[PDB]
Amino acid sequence: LTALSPRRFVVLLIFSLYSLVNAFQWIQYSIISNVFEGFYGVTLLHIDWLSMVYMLAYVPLIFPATWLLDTRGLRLTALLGSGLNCLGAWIKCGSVQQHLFWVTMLGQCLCSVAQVFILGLPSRIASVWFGPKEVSTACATAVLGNQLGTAVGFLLPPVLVPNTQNDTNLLACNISTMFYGTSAVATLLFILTAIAFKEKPRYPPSQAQAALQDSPPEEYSYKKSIRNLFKNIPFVLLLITYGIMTGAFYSVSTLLNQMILTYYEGEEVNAGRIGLTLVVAGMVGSILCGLWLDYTKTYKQTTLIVYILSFIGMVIFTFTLDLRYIIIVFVTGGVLGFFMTGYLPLGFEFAVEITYPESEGTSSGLLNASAQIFGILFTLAQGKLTSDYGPKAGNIFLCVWMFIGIILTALIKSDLRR
């Protein structure tokens, strides 16, 4: 007996809203990094770690959290993710004093742990609550909610918190409004989850879901699955290429304020708009994807073309940032974002034919973890190069790693159409 309950929209809306808030808090410091660097009296490296703790916490916690989801259930993961997102936000509101950077780092740490319960959720929520014809749309909608949070996180902080470095009293007042506004919204979404989020529908939405309930998986042996995946040569290549592409996006997002403010001083508002253009353009590219994969093309071909076009965009972005024209940075950011962040759902869909029998949870956990590892390596390396030699040295570093990703992409032997 398959039935569709009106609660699926409520569940999807609630998750996509507090998944939006989680991605908002990840980047809310980096887009105004020069504001927090002077307010907290720390170096730029301290602020970049407010964005890197999201990546660092994901790698060692993803698989224990995945085990929790498969054993306890969907509701507990939703409560923990939205609950920790709210709890971390309230800690940040208590750190609006100049000598309380470690308090906002502690609050950022709690938000980072919340993401482990959020980033892989869209696939589970879509399958559990939506029918066969709506699974892809529901999963894509929840995933895009995380990207929308990053786009909002680029735009709002430059508007909410102007760089009034000379008057620190108003600087603390503006930061309180952002932190209090975030925690108020995070608390509201936590309360809604505790009321409306449910373990499962009264009836299975899809025939596959009905069989899944009739076949309790019990254990899964992640260690067996993770070691069966590292013997798949195309998947190992896909793990590296996906991490490089997403890691470059993470590093560019973290250091976007540093590059723009190097040339265009006092351009925090436009820097926030540039990041919004990058993320929004790639959101459209994700929606347009699928139309890219025509009935003659394969996932491997589409991945190779997008990877090449993303690398070209990175080169064009690298050598146009020094031209002292903020307008072309908007155009180059949109072109770069259209391919760099529009690749994110493409890499996940390519890991379906490569990894057919093994559960999507392990492959998703590995692909996401690879992005976190590369994002840390890229942010640390590009940040070091930018702080010593300028934005061009850091941006050139990403292009070389993007070229390596092209070579590894072409070496994958896997042909299967849409």
**By CB under 6 A, what part of segment 128-147 binds ligand CHT?**
146
CB closer to ligand CHT, 88 vs 204: 88
402 near ligand CHT, judged by CB under 6 A:
no
Nearer to ligand CHT, 33 or 150 (CB): 150
Q: 254, 29 in Cβ contact below 8 A?
A: no
When the beta carbons of 247 and 391 are compared against ligand CHT, the nearer one is 247
Q: Show binding-site residues for choline.
A: 372
**DSSP code for 130:** S
Instruction: Write the DSSP assignment of 237-252 as a string of letters.
Output: HHHHHHHHHHHHHHHH
156 in contact with ligand CHT (CB under 6 A): no
Compute the least distance from the CB of residue 200 to ligand CHT, in Å.
27
Nearer to ligand CHT, 174 or 182 (CB): 182
User: What does the block give as tokens for 159?
Assistant: 């508007």
**Looking at beta carbons only, is 118 or 237 nearer to ligand CHT?**
118
55 contacts ligand CHT (rule: CB under 6 A): yes
The pair of structure tokens assigned to 86 is: 């709210």
Residue 276 as a binder of ligand CHT (CB under 6 A): the answer is: no
DSSP 341-390: TTTHHHHHHHHHHSSSSS-HHHHHHHHHHHHHHHHHHHHHHHHHHHHHH-
Total residues in contact with ligand CHT, by rule CB under 6 A: 8
Instruction: Check binding of 23 to ligand CHT (CB under 6 A).
Output: yes
Site for ligand CHT contains 190 (CB under 6 A): no
Q: Are 51 and 104 in contact (CB under 8 A)?
A: no
150 counts as binding ligand CHT under rule CB under 6 A: yes
Interface residue with ligand CHT among 26, 154, 235, 317 (CB under 6 A) is 26
Contacts of 220 (CB under 8 A, 6+ apart): 70, 359, 361, 362
By CB under 6 A, is residue 54 in contact with ligand CHT? yes
Instruction: Show binding-site residues.
Output: 115, 372
Q: Helix-strand-coil percent breakdown of the chain, rounded to 5?
A: 75, 0, 25
* Burial bucket for residue 158 (CB in 10 Å: 0-12, 13-18, 19+): buried
Of 322 and 360, nearer to ligand CHT (C-beta) is: 360
369 interacts with ligand CHT by CB under 6 A: no
Contact 398, 248 (CB under 8 A): yes
Least distance (Å) between residue 32 CB and ligand CHT: 17
Task: Catalog residues that contact ligand CHT under the rule CB under 6 A.
Answer: 23, 26, 54-55, 146, 150, 250, 372
